Amino acid sequence: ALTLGFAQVGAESGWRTANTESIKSAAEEAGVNLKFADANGEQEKQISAIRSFIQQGVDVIAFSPVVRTGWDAVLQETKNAGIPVILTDRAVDTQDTDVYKTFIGADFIEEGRRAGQWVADQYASATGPVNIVQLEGTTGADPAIDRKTGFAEGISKNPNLKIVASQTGDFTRSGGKQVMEAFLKSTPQIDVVFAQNDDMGLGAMEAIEAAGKKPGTDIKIVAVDATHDGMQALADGKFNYIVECNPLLGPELMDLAKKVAAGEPVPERVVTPDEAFDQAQAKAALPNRQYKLAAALEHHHHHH
Amino acid sequence: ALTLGFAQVGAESGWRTANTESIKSAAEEAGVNLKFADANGEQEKQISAIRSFIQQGVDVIAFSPVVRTGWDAVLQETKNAGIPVILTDRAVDTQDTDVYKTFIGADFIEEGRRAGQWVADQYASATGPVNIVQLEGTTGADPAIDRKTGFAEGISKNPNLKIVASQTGDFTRSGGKQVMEAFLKSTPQIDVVFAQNDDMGLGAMEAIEAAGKKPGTDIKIVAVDATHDGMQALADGKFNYIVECNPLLGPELMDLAKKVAAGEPVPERVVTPDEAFDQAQAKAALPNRQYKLAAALEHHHHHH
Amino acid sequence: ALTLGFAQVGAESGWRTANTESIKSAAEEAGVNLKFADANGEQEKQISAIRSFIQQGVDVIAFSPVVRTGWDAVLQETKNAGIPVILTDRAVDTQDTDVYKTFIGADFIEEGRRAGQWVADQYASATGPVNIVQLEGTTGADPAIDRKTGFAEGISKNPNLKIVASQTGDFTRSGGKQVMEAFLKSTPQIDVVFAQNDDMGLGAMEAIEAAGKKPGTDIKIVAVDATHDGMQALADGKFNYIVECNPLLGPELMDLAKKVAAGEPVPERVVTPDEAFDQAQAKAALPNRQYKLAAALEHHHHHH
Amino acid sequence: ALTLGFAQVGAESGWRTANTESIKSAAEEAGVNLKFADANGEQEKQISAIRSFIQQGVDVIAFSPVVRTGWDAVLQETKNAGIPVILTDRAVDTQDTDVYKTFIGADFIEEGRRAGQWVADQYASATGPVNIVQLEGTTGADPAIDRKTGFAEGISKNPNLKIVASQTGDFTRSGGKQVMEAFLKSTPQIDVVFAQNDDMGLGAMEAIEAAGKKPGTDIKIVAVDATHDGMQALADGKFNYIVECNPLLGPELMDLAKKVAAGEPVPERVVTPDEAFDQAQAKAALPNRQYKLAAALEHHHHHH
Numbered sequence A, B, C, D: 001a002l003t004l005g006f007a008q009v010g011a012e013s014g015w016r017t018a019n020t021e022s023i024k025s026a027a028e029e030a031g032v033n034l035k036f037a038d039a040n041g042e043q044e045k046q047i048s049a050i051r052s053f054i055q056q057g058v059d060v061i062a063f064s065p066v067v068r069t070g071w072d073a074v075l076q077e078t079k080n081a082g083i084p085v086i087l088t089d090r091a092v093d094t095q096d097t098d099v100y101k102t103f104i105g106a107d108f109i110e111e112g113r114r115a116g117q118w119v120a121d122q123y124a125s126a127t128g129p130v131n132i133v134q135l136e137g138t139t140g141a142d143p144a145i146d147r148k149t150g151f152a153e154g155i156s157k158n159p160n161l162k163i164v165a166s167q168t169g170d171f172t173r174s175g176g177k178q179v180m181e182a183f184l185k186s187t188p189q190i191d192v193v194f195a196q197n198d199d200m201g202l203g204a205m206e207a208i209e210a211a212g213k214k215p216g217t218d219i220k221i222v223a224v225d226a227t228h229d230g231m232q233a234l235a236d237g238k239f240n241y242i243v244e245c246n247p248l249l250g251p252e253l254m255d256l257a258k259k260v261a262a263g264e265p266v267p268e269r270v271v272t273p274d275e276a277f278d279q280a281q282a283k284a285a286l287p288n289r290q291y292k293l294a295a296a297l298e299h300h301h302h303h304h
């Protein structure tokens, strides 16, 4: 039977631990002998997992690139070993191809854009300036850059909206906590927080709590992911809006791995769907969430 | 309160009546004064419904064009009355600009492509020629033309697969029945039927039964829509593969109608998701179909 | 000075070589460093030409897509290199946004419609059925699909006219010849031939001659392009009707290449005019054809 | 043989006398018994010509509406007499239809837009304000309103450009002369003149001459039509840019009249092509102009 090697980022994230369960249990039903790597968020241990996959004679290799740059070498290596690659979740910035067989992930630019468009459509009648603080993702990672851009454009057509402060927090609760108290520190007027992942939004929520006033009413928070704790916080009113990012790639990852090993053809991009929730919708969405997320993913779409 | 005019094609198929239901009840519960016209499959009756919408001063107008061609005059008229137009499900082939504000529908080409690729993945080891028959949609309608193209491309890279017979059946059961009895006569070896809507496949299914062969095993059937009866046939083993086309535009149609009336900006295309089913998956998808469909639609995506 | 890359389809037809000439000499006289690739009718060779354009750092890239499908990856790549793209003559069916800056071509649907309506206006008093045979273009290319649709609609309101046989001939003389000898065998009564490019009509003309019937009077021919030899055949009475498709994009292609490179804004579609000819008009149009064609193109129109 | 009644505006214009020759001589070759009316630019004498056409038993009636409003009565009258109507050159603003069989004219909005886009692309680096004066067409006529709008949008994206003064001049030389000396009078800084027809541009040219400084260098003129004297003035350098409007409808008017009488079907809109000239291009365009214009019109396009 099939043997798949997967080189995962780390466990910075509730999304990432969800995603890791999806890959582990997905391999476990698909009948796939999975060999699984956690690079603790650092690129070179991921590349070493890759080389040890080539070095084991894996039939397929798949990973999610921590950040975009610096994979040419190891991708040409699997290139030459005869190892198909399947990209998951995050993109790589490479300039020679047939280095991999497909890329399955969300469209982060549009996640940012619909967060930005929510912000813009709330403050559509703000008489004066309305002040945005951005908790940014691990500098260099596909999602941080794309959500960066997309949210920028989403707020781009209401001139009252501008981002007063925005700096990186490594997609973490403690990161969001930390940068959120730095911005509590310097910025004196903060209306909305945009958290590139809702773990950082939860940390920032604690920082606002600690300063003594109320996430969800005084400072509004908008975040990306739709994690369990994200959604419970949104339902409780301490977030305002959350845009879904669907971590349950496991199963279509296994389908794709089988098709790429067997030499069946597979589409060049697979995009996972998203929706967004306000408070009420989140409180409706929680029941039987993992089932609903799996149906959501079965509704992915291809780019040909 | 808002008053919206909708000029529906007709009731040729279970998909169309599903969609008509979703629009009537969506207007009913978003609070919208709906004025609804049923053109009985005739373009000239749709156009005259539209003209009478203009003559009533409806605040938003929306329709689904029977065929791509011949709307120039009436769309310039709605432009010149100042009535925002929203397109639903089917495209128009127009030579004027900003004559409608957005278009919410499925990606018909990709539905055809995913059916054609199912045929290709089944007959990947076909010893000799494999004979496909195509039941085509209302000649002139967006979905028929696109589904033809996509299915053509999906089988396009397995030379054993060839479409020997292909003719229109007007998206109706009786049409598919009739064209299928003609195909049983003319073509002496029939391996697969590709039914552009699964209503025509149900007609063809009856024709196969009557002729003394067994649908789903002697002649395989692949179809588009995933209507109620489509899915029942698929679960009973009498179809082989169905690609979903999601009729429940009602609610997002109302969202868009409100914001274009209010002059809010809305994305220029809204694409409704799709999934495909084999027999087993068909039996699982049936249980809370209307709820699941509505969730699929809440996972749509924009083109901006 | 400016350097432009153009990836042409191939040389399947007199129209295509006409167009290739117009591009080479237009670049030569607008002062443009042209790098020109001939893909011999194969998509994968066009894509690789494009990738090598990126690898050369060309300032603008332009091509004409063999078929609508399968450019997602390479167009996102040109996007990500920052190379403006200009589409010429044939459309792409893409699921991404602003991946090209403008599209300059003819209106293929209307060419098909004007041929179909000529057939309809000729056989308006046909006593009984009138039998049409269609020679179809490269399955998958914009012009073939559109011309099919338009011709379908043009005959669509005279029930005597019916297309009994329709099959692809790859826009080549030998293709039309071959498919026409097949049509002479299978269909026993043939009144009209609709040749999606008049190269396939010249092939069919030879097939009619060889079979012992007289093109232009026994079997009538209607075709699209108005190539040199098309028009000669039309004037000799061996064709009956030709619709023009104007190959001389060279010069306006250079205009657009310069302004998109300079970052000037340019309209999103540029449509090249068409006219149709009977025998007499064919004999008049021949004399200063290249000059007249160039004037027709200077009368193009924009969609903004 | 056929009898056609045509109700022409008047003779305010070099374009209109050209157009009138086109209709008279076009009828004379097509074999059409034309009965021709000149309303001296005033609506009620045109409507009286119409009634006398109905009152004569004409087989077809065609006109060009001086201005958009006030034709409902007489169009319902020919409506009920059984007289097909063909619109030429100018549109009517009516709200009940099948009152006429087609409308053949130029797209005035785009004529204005490409004049505005020429202006905008010259003053692309103007360090400070650049000041536009508009000579407007007969208030109420399709072309005046549309060119109004189109030119507005063409200048719309260079903020240095604004129209300091713009008022009506009845599409006349004396009108342009008159309004041009009124604006010589009030506006103290005038860089460019936009003349909605180049007869008014010629009058304004004389007014500038008379004040003692130089059309074409100090005040630039841009006009619409491409009349004989317009083009000679542009070639002489006293205009800067002229956008073609093609008056030679005669022949396609006769084709359409025959098809509408015989009950053949005709497309619902016919759009006549345009190009624009700078000095050099005008000096190239003049030789054999009437022939070139006729070829231009044979390149019209339909809206279906």
Ligand SMILES: C[C@@H](O)[C@@H]1O[C@@H](O)[C@H](O)[C@H]1O
Binding pocket: A012, A013, A014, A015, A016, A089, A090, A143, A171, A196, A197, A198, A199, A224, A225, A245
């Ligand atoms: C979408 C993924 O790339 C992101 O990675 C995780 O660390 C974050 O929680 C997710 O948003």
Ligand SMILES: C[C@@H](O)[C@@H]1O[C@@H](O)[C@H](O)[C@H]1O
Binding pocket: B012, B013, B014, B015, B016, B089, B090, B143, B171, B196, B197, B198, B199, B224, B225, B245
């Ligand atoms: C996609 C829709 O336009 C189609 O219309 C109905 O007639 C068919 O069942 C659907 O597939």
Ligand SMILES: C[C@@H](O)[C@@H]1O[C@@H](O)[C@H](O)[C@H]1O
Binding pocket: C012, C013, C014, C015, C016, C089, C090, C143, C171, C196, C197, C198, C199, C224, C225, C245
């Ligand atoms: C319109 C063009 O794409 C077509 O390409 C050539 O192969 C044919 O002759 C033309 O009609």
Ligand SMILES: C[C@@H](O)[C@@H]1O[C@@H](O)[C@H](O)[C@H]1O
Binding pocket: D012, D013, D014, D015, D016, D089, D090, D143, D171, D196, D197, D198, D199, D224, D225, D245
């Ligand atoms: C286009 C026509 O409507 C206009 O009428 C004439 O008076 C002007 O010279 C033309 O521009």
Ligand SMILES: [Zn+2]
Binding pocket: A228, A229
């Ligand atoms: Zn949990």
Ligand SMILES: [Zn+2]
Binding pocket: A244, A274, A275, A292, A293, A296, B299
């Ligand atoms: Zn979801």
Ligand SMILES: [Zn+2]
Binding pocket: A267, A302, A304, B110, B113, B114
């Ligand atoms: Zn696909």
Ligand SMILES: [Zn+2]
Binding pocket: A270, A300, A301, A302
């Ligand atoms: Zn898929």
Ligand SMILES: [Zn+2]
Binding pocket: B021, B024, B025
């Ligand atoms: Zn109901």
Ligand SMILES: [Zn+2]
Binding pocket: B072, B073, B076, B095, B096, D269, D303
């Ligand atoms: Zn139009």
Ligand SMILES: [Zn+2]
Binding pocket: B095, C271, C301, C302, C303
């Ligand atoms: Zn057009």
Ligand SMILES: [Zn+2]
Binding pocket: B095, D271, D301, D302, D303
């Ligand atoms: Zn047009």
Ligand SMILES: [Zn+2]
Binding pocket: B091, B108, B142, B146
């Ligand atoms: Zn479409």
Ligand SMILES: [Zn+2]
Binding pocket: B228, B229
């Ligand atoms: Zn049912």
Ligand SMILES: [Zn+2]
Binding pocket: A299, B244, B274, B275, B292, B293, B296
């Ligand atoms: Zn579904």
Ligand SMILES: [Zn+2]
Binding pocket: A110, A113, A114, B267, B302, B304
């Ligand atoms: Zn969006």
